[PDB]
Amino acid sequence: THFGVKYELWQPECELTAELRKTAGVAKMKVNSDLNSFKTLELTKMKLLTFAAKFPESKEALTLRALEAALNTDLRALRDNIANGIDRAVRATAYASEAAGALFSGIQTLHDATDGTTYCLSASGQGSNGNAAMASQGCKPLALPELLTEDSYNTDVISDKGFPKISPLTNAQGQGKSGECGLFQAASGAQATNTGVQFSGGSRINLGLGAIVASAAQQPTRPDLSDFSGTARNQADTLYGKAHASITELLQLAQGPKPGQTEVETMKLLAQKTAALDSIKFQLAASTGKKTSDYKEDENLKTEYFGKTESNIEALWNKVKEEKVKGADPEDPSKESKISDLNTEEQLQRVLDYYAVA
Amino acid sequence: THFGVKYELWQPECELTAELRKTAGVAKMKVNSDLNSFKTLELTKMKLLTFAAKFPESKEALTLRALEAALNTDLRALRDNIANGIDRAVRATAYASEAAGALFSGIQTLHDATDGTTYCLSASGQGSNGNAAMASQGCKPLALPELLTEDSYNTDVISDKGFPKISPLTNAQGQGKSGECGLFQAASGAQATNTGVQFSGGSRINLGLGAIVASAAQQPTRPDLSDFSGTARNQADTLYGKAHASITELLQLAQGPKPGQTEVETMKLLAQKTAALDSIKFQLAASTGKKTSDYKEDENLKTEYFGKTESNIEALWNKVKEEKVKGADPEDPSKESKISDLNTEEQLQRVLDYYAVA
Incomplete structure (x- = not known):
């Protein structure tokens, strides 16, 4: 119980954050x-x-x-x-950046729900301190470079189908270290009288505009965002879907x-x-x-x-x-x-x- | 205790979102x-x-x-x-959009911590239901229109100095209706074994990448994001600062x-x-x-x-x-x-x- 969010759930979302941030540069390069x-x-x-x-x-x-x-x-x-190019660069930079923002805020909420001893973000190898790897995986404040050079996205993170590495984690497999984090623990009653979220009558922890949802106690889930035509068809209309369509209209x-x-x-x-x-x-x-x-x-x-x-x-x-x-x-x-x-x-x-x- | 977040802390942030989303249109017309x-x-x-x-x-x-x-x-x-416009138009859309994405993100989270009876966002006049006022105030998914028609940011929502209406709230002013939300209620001990955030060792509920921080139980706050030159100088290098800087370099x-x-x-x-x-x-x-x-x-x-x-x-x-x-x-x-x-x-x-x- 008391589980951090597994490295394998949050790390692909930091890697995708770093990549979406390339749209500004790719967009002017065109x-x-x-x-x-x-x-x-x-x-x-x-x-x-x-x-x-x-x-x-x-x-x-x-x-x-x-x-x-x-x-x-x-x-x-x-x-x-x-x-045409101006208009496709601006829209694809708005959708891609609202998407990189929402992704980053969501993991920031997890990084700050630590107390110095245990962490809501687990390291790989079910390690407790995932907070120490966050920046090196691209969850990092936005600071656009002096030279907006870039024409290309790594196609293993963003490709023509969707974000290939954002494979769904359904229940129990978004779970990181035990005895670490109290965010996904169901309240002992309704939220009016209790602490935390009760995960009842529609109560969920939705972080990052769908990017990390837990509708049920102790299971943080990431959505399928790997192919907005194939498997991930239903997420095509999400911020992350729209963001991907924009990056292809752009490309x-x-x-x-x-x-x-x-x-x-x-x-x-x-x-x-x-x-x-x-x-x-x-x-x-x-x-x-x-x-x-x-x-x-x-x-x-x-x-x-x-x-x-x-x-x-x-x-x-x-x-x-x-x-x-x-x-x-x-x-x-x-x-x-x-x-x-x-x-x-x-x-x-x-x-x-x-x-x-x- | 068990307060939703007050309309006076969240609504100004929803309108700032819809305002920042004008950067696409604005940059395009320039x-x-x-x-x-x-x-x-x-x-x-x-x-x-x-x-x-x-x-x-x-x-x-x-x-x-x-x-x-x-x-x-x-x-x-x-x-x-x-x-020279392309470069300014894309960086200001990049920054102003990470900010709009992060703002709607955090408030989306308060939206989903409901059970269909109590609400973590309060309506105007300390009412319970802030959840129903959300989109009308600007917090809704990004749907860029056909024809980005825009030359006009509202100046009292985005000045030459900062984002005016977002005046700091420091301790009790974020609290909305009591007996509504158990998100800011302290955990009854170490989060390693209790539900929630205890707010010790350095644990805050950090929502919206800084836009809604509760560092102490019972009480949601907001930064001074209204003068990156003087009054809120300290916030100039945050995402909200940088966003304000780039929108300004654009204009x-x-x-x-x-x-x-x-x-x-x-x-x-x-x-x-x-x-x-x-x-x-x-x-x-x-x-x-x-x-x-x-x-x-x-x-x-x-x-x-x-x-x-x-x-x-x-x-x-x-x-x-x-x-x-x-x-x-x-x-x-x-x-x-x-x-x-x-x-x-x-x-x-x-x-x-x-x-x-x-």
């Missing part, structure tokens, strides 16, 4: 890479535009403008995707358009977007007094301009990267710099203004 | 306002660019190119602020650049910024093969192009908006439209591509 993509794509569509501003009349410029119309749809995709969020490792891949990838072919057709139609419906030779157009397996794009990049252009320096507009070495939107906006007036 | 600004301004930069594409050598094309260079530093500023990030109510006001404002005039000075040196440093006549340069009190700018717009431009028909690049009709970015990227090819 939104931050669509922003980083927009930073790199912006720079690439301006190394393509400064060349096209220099030789407006050529066909390199025609192709570079098609590639730019595709890059501009890509950037509208990233920009409008960010509003299943799509990153918007992303650059390649080099510019020739970003350009090849752009060359395959239909926004590219559409711009070839519109600019051809415009330069020759035709309609855009006069150009329906799709693959023939694609091979002329981009090449089979985009074989023309490596070379087009090699042309753009070496071109010396003017305007980059703000004091002296006639100083020339190569496009490969021009790496800021301020510089690149100056070269484009330069030719716009030149 | 970042979303910057994105909506970016969206509206990018359309307007397209609309500037079409007139300048048509007449690339007017005084106007110079004026509008300058205006887009002012507008471009703004969008970079807006991108800086969104990135301390200023909104970034915003459009005017009309493009005419967006333009008047841009005329007033330094990068517009830095642009004019650049353009002209580039034309006249000299340096930007030779153009020291700031306010009269400003006068020619922008106008005294801008003034001229309002006409610059009304003349751009009426201009017939070509390129906006997907199919027939010769059909003409007024720029005040080209409102998607797809029609306007087409106009730009048209004059580039033509």
